[PDB]
Amino acid sequence: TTDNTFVSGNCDVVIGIVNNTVYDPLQPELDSFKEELDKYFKNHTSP
Amino acid sequence: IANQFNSAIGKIQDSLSSTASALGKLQDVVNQNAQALNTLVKQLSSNFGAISSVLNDILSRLDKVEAEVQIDRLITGRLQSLQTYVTQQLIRAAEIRASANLAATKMSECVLGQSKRVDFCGKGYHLMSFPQSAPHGVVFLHVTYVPAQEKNFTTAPAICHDGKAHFPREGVFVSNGTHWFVTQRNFYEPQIITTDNTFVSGNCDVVIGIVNNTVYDPLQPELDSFKEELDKYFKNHTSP
Amino acid sequence: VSMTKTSVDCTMYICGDSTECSNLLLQYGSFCTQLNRALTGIAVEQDKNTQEVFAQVKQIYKTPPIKDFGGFNFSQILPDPSKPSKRSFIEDLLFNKVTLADAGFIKQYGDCLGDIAARDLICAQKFNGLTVLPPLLTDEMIAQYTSALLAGTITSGWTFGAGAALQIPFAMQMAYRFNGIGVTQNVLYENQKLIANQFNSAIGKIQDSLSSTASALGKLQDVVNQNAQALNTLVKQLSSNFGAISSVLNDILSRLDKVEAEVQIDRLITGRLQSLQTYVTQQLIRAAEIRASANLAATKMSECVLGQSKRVDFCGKGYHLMSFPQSAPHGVVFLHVTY
Amino acid sequence: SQSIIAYTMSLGVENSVAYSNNSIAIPTNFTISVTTEILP
Ligand SMILES: *[C@@H]1O[C@H](CO)[C@@H](O[C@@H]2O[C@H](CO)[C@@H](O[C@H]3O[C@H](CO)[C@@H](O)[C@H](O)[C@@H]3O)[C@H](O)[C@H]2NC(C)=O)[C@H](O)[C@H]1NC(C)=O
Ligand SMILES: *[C@@H]1O[C@H](CO)[C@@H](O[C@@H]2O[C@H](CO)[C@@H](O[C@H]3O[C@H](CO)[C@@H](O)[C@H](O)[C@@H]3O)[C@H](O)[C@H]2NC(C)=O)[C@H](O)[C@H]1NC(C)=O
Ligand SMILES: *[C@@H]1O[C@H](CO)[C@@H](O[C@@H]2O[C@H](CO)[C@@H](O[C@H]3O[C@H](CO)[C@@H](O)[C@H](O)[C@@H]3O)[C@H](O)[C@H]2NC(C)=O)[C@H](O)[C@H]1NC(C)=O
Ligand SMILES: *[C@@H]1O[C@H](CO)[C@@H](O[C@@H]2O[C@H](CO)[C@@H](O[C@H]3O[C@H](CO)[C@@H](O)[C@H](O)[C@@H]3O)[C@H](O)[C@H]2NC(C)=O)[C@H](O)[C@H]1NC(C)=O
Ligand SMILES: *[C@@H]1O[C@H](CO)[C@@H](O[C@@H]2O[C@H](CO)[C@@H](O[C@H]3O[C@H](CO)[C@@H](O)[C@H](O)[C@@H]3O)[C@H](O)[C@H]2NC(C)=O)[C@H](O)[C@H]1NC(C)=O
Ligand SMILES: *[C@@H]1O[C@H](CO)[C@@H](O[C@@H]2O[C@H](CO)[C@@H](O[C@H]3O[C@H](CO)[C@@H](O)[C@H](O)[C@@H]3O)[C@H](O)[C@H]2NC(C)=O)[C@H](O)[C@H]1NC(C)=O
Ligand SMILES: *[C@@H]1O[C@H](CO[C@@H]2O[C@@H](C)[C@@H](O)[C@@H](O)[C@@H]2O)[C@@H](O[C@@H]2O[C@H](CO)[C@@H](O)[C@H](O)[C@H]2NC(C)=O)[C@H](O)[C@H]1NC(C)=O
Ligand SMILES: *[C@@H]1O[C@H](CO)[C@@H](O)[C@H](O)[C@H]1NC(C)=O
Ligand SMILES: *[C@@H]1O[C@H](CO)[C@@H](O)[C@H](O)[C@H]1NC(C)=O
Ligand SMILES: *[C@@H]1O[C@H](CO)[C@@H](O)[C@H](O)[C@H]1NC(C)=O
Ligand SMILES: *[C@@H]1O[C@H](CO)[C@@H](O)[C@H](O)[C@H]1NC(C)=O
């Protein structure tokens, strides 16, 4: 994760680097807020 | 910290202006070389069983043949007096060497650096040291942080909050008996227990002595103020 | 940490109860004062070495009566009230496993004439003018300094070395240790019963090992044997003629006139004075090794007991957590605890 | 009114530490100490 790791530079310079995902814990904490906002906007179409 | 340092350098200056015996480490090393030489001069008064200790008195009062028998005694005795002095000086030199290698190690590790070695660069936690010359030696003024005015607190190895168990990232948990905080280990500066101050591992069934307190998430009031912003914006959008 | 302090009466060794020999010995000048002074210098230094190794605390820490150390069982290395000196269980093995030739504690003659004189050699050393002097800190006061260091260590972590003793729960001290070896403190708490049961079992292996094999304490026993062999050798040299008519000072005086006796006596004076100068040189060279060992032991007391060491292989094999000092005859045993 | 006394030496002042499975002491303040050390 972004808490467990730090970033410097691009992937070209590091000998032996591997591709893998690095998870951001802020993303799904805001994605439930996107699904909350989406259901709130769609509910505001009903009255 | 500057006033305490400036005052402590003042106490060194007054202490060195007052007592004699503190430099005994160096004065004894001068006294031992002086005593060894005074003793080696005194041995020129011993007869060693010759008719006289004075070499000219032997050579002037006796002819060649019995003079060799008297002089050989003074040679044999004096030569053992030199071998005693030189053996003793090699053993002292071996001590002074060990003290010089210790002093070179303290110059490297206390002056040119900072030491994690307990009680090596003086008593207390080492900050830095200043070398000073002295006759046949070195004086180190070690500067050390000593923790001074302790208070008791209740403590716990971990906090349980959201069923999960939390531990300090650095420092320790404390309570005044009503609230809980993290603080750094070596100085009391309490802070609210948070998801930045602490790291999470496992559930709170396994940790002996874990305690219940809230662990604050500093992102929650960012999103919740952004929710009261969004709620007033939705409420307003009912009006036009 | 130390060795037996010895004083040798140079006049009584060379010239035992003869004034004829004493008046000849004065012709050799200040040598007996140099010998007395050198052995005094060694004897003073054995207390200094013991102060530097054990007296690293100005306060004597007493352990609480309750033993709530998070499951770690120090009862083998803490004192017990049941014994008339406050030694631990492991220290009472150490004081039995090194045989101590002459402690110096009062030869009242009722112990040193008669039946015992036909089997004890220490009385012959004493009667020839060789005397072993007691340490300033007896095995009770060394046990109290070791108790205070250990009580401070299990109750207060490293802080009693830096300043005041600040209490901390033992399972939190062990967590501060784990963070010191780069292992995250949750690894202690998620395994605390295992880590305690392993420490308790490892202290059990120390107890059984010390109960079983002799050779491990050879580091201390051979320091006692060297000082004992050096003094037995110095007593044996009183049997040598050095080319005189006799090994016995009274026999030479029982049979020769003043002018001829002095030529036999000064042979024994010259040979015995070499025999002392060999012994004193050898003891100064031994003292220089024991000193280096006492400075190493003082450095391990400071860095392994009063602290936690990042220095590889200095405080035991493995990553250092903590160490517990234990007293021994002329020595210190460190129980290094390592991850 | 002065003379040679003789005594068993004190090792240091006795100081039992206030231990508990849940008690910690933390320093609210510090003193910078300067100490001289002298080596031949
Ligand atoms: C890890 O993943 C990377 C992207 O997911 C990947 O990089 C991609 O590599 C390919 C092949 O080198 C590139 O394809 C381009 O190749 C040349 C130009 O360089 C052209 O002929 C092609 O038409 C095409 O443009 C991708 O553009 C490149 N993309 C990225 C984002 O890097 C790495 O190769 C992967 N690493 C490993 C070890 O497989
Ligand atoms: C344990 O630590 C707590 C945090 O420092 C402390 O609680 C805090 O106490 C102060 C008062 O001493 C409160 O300050 C407020 O007090 C009144 C409230 O009406 C106001 O007039 C003041 O302006 C000020 O706002 C803090 O609000 C309070 N914090 C909390 C979260 O309650 C405890 O007192 C400490 N307990 C002990 C036993 O020492
Ligand atoms: C710390 O806070 C915890 C959460 O509030 C609290 O845990 C709760 O403890 C009670 C009592 O042990 C549990 O109640 C259940 O107990 C048994 C089943 O285990 C049943 O007889 C009961 O009907 C009931 O189901 C709660 O389930 C438990 N909650 C959770 C989420 O585990 C701790 O007790 C608190 N501890 C301290 C020292 O404050
Ligand atoms: C801390 O570790 C100690 C060493 O293992 C342990 O002491 C030992 O305790 C056992 C159990 O009582 C003793 O075993 C004897 O116990 C009774 C004596 O009447 C008998 O029923 C048994 O057959 C057996 O003879 C050990 O002898 C004893 N060892 C010593 C040196 O005292 C402590 O109990 C441990 N304490 C904790 C809190 O774990
Ligand atoms: C990490 O290493 C530990 C050893 O240092 C190991 O602990 C040992 O675990 C086994 C079980 O896996 C226990 O075995 C005994 O269990 C009972 C008696 O209590 C008996 O039924 C068994 O026949 C056997 O005698 C050991 O007692 C236990 N040792 C200790 C000191 O507790 C851990 O299992 C290892 N952990 C991991 C995660 O690998
Ligand atoms: C941390 O310890 C400090 C001592 O090393 C302490 O500083 C001392 O604070 C007192 C006041 O609380 C000062 O007392 C003097 O104040 C004036 C003169 O400046 C006079 O009117 C008073 O009669 C009295 O003599 C000390 O001079 C001061 N010492 C230093 C070196 O600054 C701190 O207060 C302590 N800090 C905390 C947070 O406890
Ligand atoms: C830290 O606590 C110890 C002992 O525990 C406390 O004992 C009560 C006084 C009360 O505060 C309890 O809630 C605590 O558990 C204090 O040690 C005592 O100090 C006094 C002198 O001030 C002394 O007469 C007692 O014999 C001590 N008792 C023990 C058990 O050692 C200590 O003073 C506290 N530290 C600070 C800085 O306040
Ligand atoms: C590791 O060595 C192998 C050959 O044994 C090679 O194919 C591979 O590319 C090397 N990887 C790196 C990161 O150097
Ligand atoms: C939709 O909004 C109305 C209020 O305007 C509320 O009564 C209703 O329960 C909402 N439904 C959902 C699914 O949020
Ligand atoms: C601490 O000790 C007390 C008994 O004095 C006990 O009641 C309590 O449960 C213990 N807590 C821990 C975490 O060991
Ligand atoms: C409501 O939205 C309109 C946008 O036309 C704006 O003029 C008005 O000031 C808003 N009121 C609040 C309370 O945001």
Side-chain angles (χ1 to χ4, degrees), chain B residues 35 43 46-48 80 88 95 117 119 124-125 150 152 155-157 168 172 185 199 201, chain C residues 27-30 37 161-162 166-167 172 176 184-186 189-190 274 284 291 302-303 311:
Chain B
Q35 184 181 54
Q43 280 289 11
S46 303
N47 297 308
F48 304 113
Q80 213 81 46
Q88 291 279 20
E95 189 292 331
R117 303 174 63 180
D119 291 3
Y125 298 100
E150 70 281 2
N152 297 333
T155 188
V172 69
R185 263 173 268 284
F199 79 88
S201 181
Chain C
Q27 311 310 308
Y28 292 79
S30 191
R37 185 175 295 130
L166 305 183
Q167 72 279 1
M172 299 190 71
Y176 291 91
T184 313
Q185 57 182 321
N186 65 316
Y189 302 121
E190 294 180 1
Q274 291 289 0
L284 285 166
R291 177 172 57 180
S302 296
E303 296 182 43
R311 298 171 59 197

Short mmCIF file of all heavy atoms in Angstrom, two decimals, chain B residues 35 43 46-48 80 88 95 117 119 124-125 150 152 155-157 168 172 185 199 201, chain C residues 27-30 37 161-162 166-167 172 176 184-186 189-190 274 284 291 302-303 311:
data_model
loop_
_atom_site.label_atom_id
_atom_site.label_comp_id
_atom_site.label_asym_id
_atom_site.label_seq_id
_atom_site.Cartn_x
_atom_site.Cartn_y
_atom_site.Cartn_z
N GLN B 35 58.85 8.38 40.52
CA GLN B 35 59.24 7.45 41.58
C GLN B 35 60.15 6.34 41.06
O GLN B 35 61.13 5.99 41.71
CB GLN B 35 57.97 6.87 42.21
CG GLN B 35 58.29 5.96 43.40
CD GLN B 35 57.02 5.39 44.00
OE1 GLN B 35 56.20 4.77 43.32
NE2 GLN B 35 56.79 5.53 45.29
N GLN B 43 69.44 3.28 43.80
CA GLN B 43 70.20 2.04 43.67
C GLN B 43 71.70 2.24 43.39
O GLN B 43 72.50 1.35 43.65
CB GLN B 43 69.56 1.14 42.60
CG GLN B 43 68.35 0.38 43.15
CD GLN B 43 68.72 -0.73 44.13
OE1 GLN B 43 69.85 -0.86 44.60
NE2 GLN B 43 67.80 -1.57 44.52
N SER B 46 73.61 1.44 46.72
CA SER B 46 73.68 0.07 47.23
C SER B 46 75.09 -0.49 47.07
O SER B 46 75.73 -0.28 46.04
CB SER B 46 72.69 -0.80 46.49
OG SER B 46 71.40 -0.25 46.63
N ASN B 47 75.60 -1.22 48.05
CA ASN B 47 76.92 -1.85 47.95
C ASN B 47 76.89 -3.12 47.09
O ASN B 47 77.92 -3.53 46.58
CB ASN B 47 77.44 -2.20 49.35
CG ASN B 47 77.65 -0.99 50.23
OD1 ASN B 47 78.30 -0.02 49.87
ND2 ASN B 47 77.11 -0.99 51.43
N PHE B 48 75.75 -3.81 47.02
CA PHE B 48 75.61 -5.16 46.47
C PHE B 48 76.60 -6.18 47.04
O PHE B 48 76.85 -7.23 46.45
CB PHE B 48 75.56 -5.11 44.94
CG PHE B 48 74.47 -4.21 44.40
CD1 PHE B 48 74.79 -3.03 43.72
CD2 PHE B 48 73.12 -4.56 44.60
CE1 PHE B 48 73.76 -2.21 43.22
CE2 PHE B 48 72.10 -3.73 44.12
CZ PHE B 48 72.42 -2.56 43.42
N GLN B 80 70.86 -5.49 37.19
CA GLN B 80 69.55 -5.97 37.64
C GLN B 80 68.62 -4.81 38.03
O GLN B 80 67.40 -4.90 37.87
CB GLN B 80 69.73 -6.93 38.82
CG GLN B 80 68.65 -8.02 38.82
CD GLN B 80 68.96 -9.16 37.85
OE1 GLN B 80 70.07 -9.67 37.78
NE2 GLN B 80 68.01 -9.65 37.08
N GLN B 88 59.53 -2.91 34.49
CA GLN B 88 58.45 -2.10 35.04
C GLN B 88 57.97 -1.05 34.04
O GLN B 88 56.76 -0.91 33.88
CB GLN B 88 58.90 -1.44 36.35
CG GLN B 88 59.10 -2.43 37.50
CD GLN B 88 57.81 -2.82 38.22
OE1 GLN B 88 56.70 -2.68 37.71
NE2 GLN B 88 57.88 -3.29 39.44
N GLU B 95 50.18 -0.44 29.83
CA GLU B 95 48.97 0.09 30.44
C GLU B 95 48.59 1.41 29.76
O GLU B 95 47.44 1.60 29.35
CB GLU B 95 49.18 0.31 31.94
CG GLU B 95 47.91 0.66 32.71
CD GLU B 95 47.36 2.02 32.34
OE1 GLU B 95 48.16 2.91 31.97
OE2 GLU B 95 46.13 2.21 32.44
N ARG B 117 26.25 3.52 22.71
CA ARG B 117 26.81 2.69 23.77
C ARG B 117 26.52 3.29 25.13
O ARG B 117 26.93 4.41 25.42
CB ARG B 117 28.32 2.52 23.57
CG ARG B 117 28.71 1.94 22.22
CD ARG B 117 30.22 1.93 22.03
NE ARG B 117 30.89 1.09 23.02
CZ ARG B 117 32.21 0.92 23.07
NH1 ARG B 117 32.99 1.53 22.19
NH2 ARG B 117 32.74 0.13 24.00
N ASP B 119 26.74 4.32 28.91
CA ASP B 119 27.83 4.73 29.81
C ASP B 119 29.24 4.78 29.18
O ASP B 119 30.21 4.99 29.91
CB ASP B 119 27.77 3.98 31.16
CG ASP B 119 26.59 4.37 32.07
OD1 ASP B 119 25.73 5.19 31.69
OD2 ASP B 119 26.56 3.86 33.21
N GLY B 124 24.40 9.02 31.34
CA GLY B 124 23.29 9.62 30.60
C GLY B 124 23.24 9.18 29.14
O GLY B 124 24.10 8.42 28.68
N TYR B 125 22.24 9.63 28.39
CA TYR B 125 22.19 9.43 26.95
C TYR B 125 23.13 10.41 26.26
O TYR B 125 23.05 11.61 26.50
CB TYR B 125 20.76 9.59 26.43
CG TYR B 125 19.76 8.61 26.99
CD1 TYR B 125 18.91 9.00 28.04
CD2 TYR B 125 19.66 7.33 26.45
CE1 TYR B 125 17.95 8.10 28.54
CE2 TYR B 125 18.71 6.42 26.95
CZ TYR B 125 17.86 6.80 28.00
OH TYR B 125 16.96 5.92 28.50
N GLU B 150 10.24 12.64 36.53
CA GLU B 150 9.25 11.65 36.14
C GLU B 150 7.89 11.80 36.83
O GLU B 150 7.81 12.18 38.00
CB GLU B 150 9.83 10.24 36.28
CG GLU B 150 10.06 9.71 37.70
CD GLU B 150 11.34 10.21 38.40
OE1 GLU B 150 12.09 11.03 37.83
OE2 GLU B 150 11.61 9.78 39.54
N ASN B 152 4.22 9.20 37.15
CA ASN B 152 3.60 7.91 36.89
C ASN B 152 2.42 8.07 35.93
O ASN B 152 1.66 9.03 36.03
CB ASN B 152 3.11 7.30 38.21
CG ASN B 152 4.20 6.98 39.20
OD1 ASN B 152 5.35 6.74 38.85
ND2 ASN B 152 3.82 6.99 40.47
N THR B 155 -0.51 2.44 31.85
CA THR B 155 -0.10 2.10 30.48
C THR B 155 -0.70 0.78 30.02
O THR B 155 -1.20 -0.01 30.83
CB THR B 155 1.42 2.12 30.35
OG1 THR B 155 1.80 1.97 29.01
CG2 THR B 155 2.12 1.01 31.14
N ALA B 156 -0.70 0.56 28.72
CA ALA B 156 -1.18 -0.64 28.08
C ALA B 156 -0.31 -0.97 26.87
O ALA B 156 0.18 -0.05 26.21
CB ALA B 156 -2.64 -0.42 27.66
N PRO B 157 -0.14 -2.25 26.52
CA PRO B 157 0.64 -2.63 25.35
C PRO B 157 -0.06 -2.27 24.04
O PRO B 157 0.60 -2.09 23.02
CB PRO B 157 0.82 -4.14 25.49
CG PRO B 157 -0.37 -4.59 26.32
CD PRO B 157 -0.60 -3.41 27.25
N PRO B 168 1.54 1.53 19.17
CA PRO B 168 2.20 2.78 18.79
C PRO B 168 3.17 2.60 17.62
O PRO B 168 3.90 1.62 17.58
CB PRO B 168 2.95 3.23 20.04
CG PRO B 168 2.31 2.46 21.18
CD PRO B 168 1.89 1.16 20.52
N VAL B 172 4.84 5.17 23.26
CA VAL B 172 4.13 4.29 24.20
C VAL B 172 2.77 4.87 24.54
O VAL B 172 2.59 6.09 24.50
CB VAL B 172 5.01 4.09 25.44
CG1 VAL B 172 5.16 5.34 26.30
CG2 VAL B 172 4.48 2.96 26.31
N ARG B 185 8.95 7.89 24.04
CA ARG B 185 9.48 7.11 25.18
C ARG B 185 10.25 7.92 26.21
O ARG B 185 10.17 7.64 27.40
CB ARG B 185 10.41 6.01 24.62
CG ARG B 185 9.70 4.67 24.48
CD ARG B 185 10.61 3.65 23.78
NE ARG B 185 10.39 3.63 22.32
CZ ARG B 185 9.38 3.08 21.69
NH1 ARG B 185 8.46 2.41 22.32
NH2 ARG B 185 9.25 3.17 20.40
N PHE B 199 -0.31 1.66 14.46
CA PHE B 199 -0.45 0.64 13.43
C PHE B 199 -1.26 -0.54 13.97
O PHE B 199 -1.31 -0.79 15.17
CB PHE B 199 0.92 0.21 12.89
CG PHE B 199 1.68 -0.75 13.77
CD1 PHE B 199 1.47 -2.14 13.64
CD2 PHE B 199 2.57 -0.27 14.74
CE1 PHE B 199 2.11 -3.03 14.51
CE2 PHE B 199 3.23 -1.17 15.59
CZ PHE B 199 2.98 -2.55 15.49
N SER B 201 -2.56 -4.61 14.05
CA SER B 201 -2.24 -6.02 13.81
C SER B 201 -3.17 -6.94 14.60
O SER B 201 -3.23 -6.86 15.82
CB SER B 201 -0.78 -6.31 14.15
OG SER B 201 -0.48 -7.66 13.90
N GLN C 27 72.26 -4.75 51.88
CA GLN C 27 73.27 -4.37 50.90
C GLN C 27 72.73 -4.34 49.47
O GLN C 27 73.35 -3.73 48.62
CB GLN C 27 74.48 -5.32 50.97
CG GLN C 27 75.02 -5.55 52.39
CD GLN C 27 75.25 -4.26 53.16
OE1 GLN C 27 75.91 -3.34 52.69
NE2 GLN C 27 74.73 -4.14 54.36
N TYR C 28 71.59 -4.99 49.20
CA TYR C 28 70.92 -4.98 47.90
C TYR C 28 69.94 -3.80 47.76
O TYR C 28 69.33 -3.62 46.71
CB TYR C 28 70.26 -6.34 47.66
CG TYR C 28 71.23 -7.49 47.46
CD1 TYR C 28 71.86 -8.08 48.57
CD2 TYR C 28 71.49 -7.97 46.17
CE1 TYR C 28 72.76 -9.15 48.39
CE2 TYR C 28 72.38 -9.04 45.98
CZ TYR C 28 73.02 -9.63 47.09
OH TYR C 28 73.85 -10.70 46.92
N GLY C 29 69.82 -2.95 48.79
CA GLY C 29 69.11 -1.68 48.69
C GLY C 29 67.60 -1.83 48.61
O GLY C 29 67.00 -2.65 49.31
N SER C 30 66.97 -1.01 47.77
CA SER C 30 65.52 -0.80 47.73
C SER C 30 64.71 -1.92 47.06
O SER C 30 63.50 -1.74 46.85
CB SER C 30 65.24 0.54 47.04
OG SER C 30 63.89 0.93 47.19
N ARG C 37 55.92 -2.79 46.95
CA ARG C 37 55.14 -1.76 46.25
C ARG C 37 54.43 -2.33 45.04
O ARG C 37 53.25 -2.05 44.87
CB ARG C 37 56.05 -0.59 45.89
CG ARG C 37 55.24 0.56 45.26
CD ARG C 37 56.12 1.78 45.01
NE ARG C 37 56.61 2.37 46.27
CZ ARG C 37 57.85 2.69 46.57
NH1 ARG C 37 58.83 2.50 45.73
NH2 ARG C 37 58.13 3.21 47.72
N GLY C 161 20.45 3.00 34.14
CA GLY C 161 21.78 3.35 33.67
C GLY C 161 21.88 4.81 33.20
O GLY C 161 22.88 5.47 33.45
N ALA C 162 20.82 5.34 32.58
CA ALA C 162 20.80 6.71 32.07
C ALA C 162 20.53 7.78 33.15
O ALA C 162 20.98 8.91 33.01
CB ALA C 162 19.75 6.79 30.97
N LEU C 166 12.97 4.25 36.12
CA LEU C 166 11.59 4.50 35.72
C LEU C 166 10.92 3.15 35.52
O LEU C 166 11.36 2.38 34.66
CB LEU C 166 11.61 5.30 34.42
CG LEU C 166 12.40 6.61 34.46
CD1 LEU C 166 12.26 7.33 33.12
CD2 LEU C 166 11.89 7.56 35.53
N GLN C 167 9.90 2.81 36.30
CA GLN C 167 9.25 1.52 36.12
C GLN C 167 8.63 1.42 34.73
O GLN C 167 8.19 2.43 34.17
CB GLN C 167 8.23 1.19 37.22
CG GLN C 167 6.91 1.98 37.19
CD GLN C 167 7.00 3.36 37.81
OE1 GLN C 167 8.04 3.81 38.28
NE2 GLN C 167 5.91 4.08 37.84
N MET C 172 6.34 -4.72 28.19
CA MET C 172 6.56 -3.51 27.41
C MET C 172 8.03 -3.19 27.26
O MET C 172 8.46 -2.77 26.19
CB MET C 172 5.81 -2.33 28.03
CG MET C 172 4.31 -2.60 28.04
SD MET C 172 3.31 -1.17 28.48
CE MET C 172 3.52 -0.19 26.98
N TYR C 176 10.08 -2.93 23.71
CA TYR C 176 11.03 -1.89 23.37
C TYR C 176 12.32 -2.56 22.89
O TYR C 176 13.07 -2.00 22.10
CB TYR C 176 11.31 -0.99 24.57
CG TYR C 176 10.14 -0.12 24.97
CD1 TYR C 176 9.20 -0.56 25.89
CD2 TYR C 176 9.97 1.14 24.41
CE1 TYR C 176 8.13 0.23 26.25
CE2 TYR C 176 8.90 1.94 24.76
CZ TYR C 176 7.98 1.48 25.69
OH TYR C 176 6.92 2.27 26.04
N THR C 184 8.99 -5.85 14.96
CA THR C 184 7.89 -4.97 15.35
C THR C 184 7.23 -5.46 16.64
O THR C 184 6.97 -6.65 16.78
CB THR C 184 6.86 -4.88 14.22
OG1 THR C 184 7.49 -4.67 12.98
CG2 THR C 184 5.92 -3.71 14.43
N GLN C 185 6.93 -4.56 17.57
CA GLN C 185 6.44 -4.93 18.90
C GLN C 185 5.17 -5.79 18.95
O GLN C 185 4.95 -6.48 19.93
CB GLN C 185 6.23 -3.67 19.74
CG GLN C 185 5.27 -2.63 19.13
CD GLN C 185 5.17 -1.40 20.02
OE1 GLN C 185 5.14 -1.46 21.24
NE2 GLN C 185 5.10 -0.22 19.46
N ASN C 186 4.33 -5.81 17.91
CA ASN C 186 3.19 -6.72 17.86
C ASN C 186 3.64 -8.19 17.87
O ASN C 186 2.90 -9.04 18.37
CB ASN C 186 2.30 -6.42 16.64
CG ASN C 186 3.01 -6.67 15.33
OD1 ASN C 186 4.16 -6.32 15.16
ND2 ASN C 186 2.38 -7.30 14.38
N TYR C 189 3.70 -9.30 21.60
CA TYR C 189 2.39 -9.49 22.22
C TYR C 189 1.59 -10.64 21.62
O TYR C 189 0.96 -11.39 22.35
CB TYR C 189 1.62 -8.18 22.14
CG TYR C 189 2.33 -7.03 22.80
CD1 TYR C 189 2.66 -5.89 22.06
CD2 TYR C 189 2.69 -7.13 24.15
CE1 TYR C 189 3.31 -4.81 22.68
CE2 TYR C 189 3.38 -6.07 24.76
CZ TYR C 189 3.66 -4.91 24.03
OH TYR C 189 4.30 -3.88 24.64
N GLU C 190 1.63 -10.83 20.30
CA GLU C 190 0.98 -11.95 19.63
C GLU C 190 1.63 -13.31 19.93
O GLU C 190 1.07 -14.35 19.57
CB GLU C 190 0.91 -11.68 18.12
CG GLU C 190 -0.01 -10.49 17.79
CD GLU C 190 -0.10 -10.18 16.29
OE1 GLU C 190 0.53 -10.87 15.45
OE2 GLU C 190 -0.83 -9.22 15.92
N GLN C 274 66.07 -13.31 42.88
CA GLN C 274 65.62 -13.66 41.53
C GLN C 274 64.26 -14.37 41.56
O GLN C 274 63.37 -14.02 40.80
CB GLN C 274 66.64 -14.56 40.82
CG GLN C 274 67.95 -13.85 40.46
CD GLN C 274 67.84 -12.84 39.33
OE1 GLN C 274 66.80 -12.60 38.74
NE2 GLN C 274 68.93 -12.20 38.98
N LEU C 284 52.57 -9.21 37.71
CA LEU C 284 52.25 -7.96 37.02
C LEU C 284 51.71 -8.22 35.61
O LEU C 284 50.78 -7.54 35.17
CB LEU C 284 53.49 -7.07 36.92
CG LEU C 284 53.91 -6.37 38.20
CD1 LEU C 284 55.32 -5.83 38.03
CD2 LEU C 284 53.00 -5.18 38.51
N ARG C 291 43.21 -7.19 34.27
CA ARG C 291 42.73 -5.82 34.15
C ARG C 291 41.96 -5.68 32.83
O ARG C 291 40.84 -5.17 32.82
CB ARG C 291 43.90 -4.84 34.19
CG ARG C 291 43.49 -3.38 34.00
CD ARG C 291 44.66 -2.45 34.25
NE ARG C 291 45.80 -2.75 33.39
CZ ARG C 291 46.95 -2.08 33.41
NH1 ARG C 291 47.11 -1.06 34.24
NH2 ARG C 291 47.94 -2.42 32.59
N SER C 302 28.07 -2.39 31.37
CA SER C 302 27.49 -1.15 30.85
C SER C 302 26.63 -1.36 29.60
O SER C 302 25.53 -0.84 29.53
CB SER C 302 28.58 -0.14 30.54
OG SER C 302 29.25 0.21 31.73
N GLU C 303 27.10 -2.11 28.61
CA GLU C 303 26.45 -2.19 27.30
C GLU C 303 25.45 -3.34 27.15
O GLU C 303 24.53 -3.23 26.35
CB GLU C 303 27.51 -2.22 26.19
CG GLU C 303 28.30 -0.90 26.20
CD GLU C 303 29.37 -0.79 25.09
OE1 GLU C 303 29.12 -1.17 23.93
OE2 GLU C 303 30.45 -0.24 25.36
N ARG C 311 25.78 -4.03 18.71
CA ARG C 311 27.09 -4.59 18.33
C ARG C 311 27.02 -6.11 18.19
O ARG C 311 26.83 -6.82 19.18
CB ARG C 311 28.14 -4.19 19.37
CG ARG C 311 28.34 -2.67 19.45
CD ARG C 311 29.22 -2.29 20.64
NE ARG C 311 30.54 -2.91 20.55
CZ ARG C 311 31.40 -3.04 21.53
NH1 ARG C 311 31.21 -2.54 22.71
NH2 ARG C 311 32.50 -3.70 21.33
#
